[PDB]
Design a protein around this ligand. Sequence first.
Ligand SMILES: Cc1cn([C@H]2C[C@H](O)[C@@H](COP(=O)(O)OP(=O)(O)OP(=O)(O)O)O2)c(=O)[nH]c1=O
Ligand SMILES: *[C@@H]1O[C@@H]2Oc3cc(OC)c4c5c(c(=O)oc4c3[C@@H]2[C@H]1O)C(=O)CC5
Ligand SMILES: [Ca+2]
Ligand SMILES: [Ca+2]
Ligand SMILES: [Ca+2]
Length: 342
Amino acid sequence: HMIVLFVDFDYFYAQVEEVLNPSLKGKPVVVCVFSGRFEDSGAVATANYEARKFGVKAGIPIVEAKKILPNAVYLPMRKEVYQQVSSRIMNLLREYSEKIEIASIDEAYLDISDKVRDYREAYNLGLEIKNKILEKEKITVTVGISKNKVFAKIAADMAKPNGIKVIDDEEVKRLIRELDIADVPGIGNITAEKLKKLGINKLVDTLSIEFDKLKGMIGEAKAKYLISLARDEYNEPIRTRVRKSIGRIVTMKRNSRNLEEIKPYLFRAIEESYYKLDKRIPKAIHVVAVTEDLDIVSRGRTFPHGISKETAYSESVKLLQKILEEDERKIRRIGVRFSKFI
DNA sequence: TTGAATCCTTCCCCC
DNA sequence: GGGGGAAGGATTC
Ligand SMILES: Cc1cn([C@H]2C[C@H](O)[C@@H](COP(=O)(O)OP(=O)(O)OP(=O)(O)O)O2)c(=O)[nH]c1=O
Ligand SMILES: *[C@@H]1O[C@@H]2Oc3cc(OC)c4c5c(c(=O)oc4c3[C@@H]2[C@H]1O)C(=O)CC5
Ligand SMILES: [Ca+2]
Ligand SMILES: [Ca+2]
Ligand SMILES: [Ca+2]
């Protein structure tokens, strides 16, 4: 049938800060985003493996990370740059099979189904690709290879970092039963729990229960996706994809409810969101507000025409007025999301 | 100074 | 009953 190749860049942001300043290598590096809330306020975007050995990983507040590795290099995240270094690497890949996906700023799938005859020749295209990326951009990436996207990615997860691994149909059969289901692409612990207290702890356990008992627990989508993976009928194609939305959320010094105190933050967001749109006209706008207790509340409005900057400002303030009206908590983070492009 | 994509469940129109 | 679709959430990486 087919052979899907998965490329995923190792500790990407951290590594981009490394390549851009070689001195950092071998030393713990932690890329984080400081919110002016107070000093060291913020979380950790990511950390190279040095720091990651000792517990410092993406998500933990940076204060907790500084109590663990008070002498690691902490750097502010610069998205724009990573973005370009990604785009660059995402082209060297187009040169191995126009059938490319691109799941994120660091993940992409290739259907080298035609450029290769056997897995063995795949392991070769794998090293070729790794090698070309390492020479041209100085970045280390892991490669996964199998019969379909899901497993191609599982291969990469098993070979991180700077790894290469193929999973043939014998491993798949094996993994269908032995591979812990919580380690399957698309099963956040929230779904890993509903599955746990339902009998399904392995990919194969999904065949046991009735289909409409799943459809009512985890939804139809997750249910069909899982069964097809369990029965070995998963065969999703590698489809190119486009950004279906652009936004920006900002943290405020203090939590408040005063429209006049939040407005300016909301504009900064609206202002940057349009810079990101570049040459695109959106038709729907959303204002998301992160409550004082870290809960998300949003409000939208779709127009029959595009949204000009002036109407985004105006329409954004009403939606906000509607959020405070329908909620009681104080706002912490505020932002906008522009979708449904022209 | 941090995204963004699916999927879902609910609601409202109307043939 | 069923096709449409907009919306405010739920979930995942
Ligand atoms: C998890 C996470 C990722 N990111 C971004 C930064 C990273 O470079 C990239 C996410 O990490 P991942 O791309 O999922 O994995 P990684 O390769 O960078 O990590 P690993 O060392 O396991 O190989 O996405 C954030 O900004 N915040 C987060 O909380
Ligand atoms: C949404 O707000 C934070 O900002 C980001 C940005 C990410 O990538 C650019 C990101 C990723 C992941 C994640 O779990 O969170 C974020 C976040 C935070 C979210 O709370 C991933 O698994 C991959 C990228
Ligand atoms: Ca990744
Ligand atoms: Ca990665
Ligand atoms: Ca998981």
